[PDB]
Amino acid sequence: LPGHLKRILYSLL
């Protein structure tokens, strides 16, 4: 689904 920016930004945070 459209929302991987948050999926990867989540990785760092």
What one-character-per-residue DSSP string does 1-13 give? ----HHHHHHHH-
As a whole number of angstroms, the distance between CA 9 and CA 11 comes to 5
Q: Determined by which method?
A: NMR
As a whole number of angstroms, the distance between CA 4 and CA 11 comes to 11
Buried b (16+ CB within 10 A) or exposed e, 1-13: eeeeeeeeeeeee
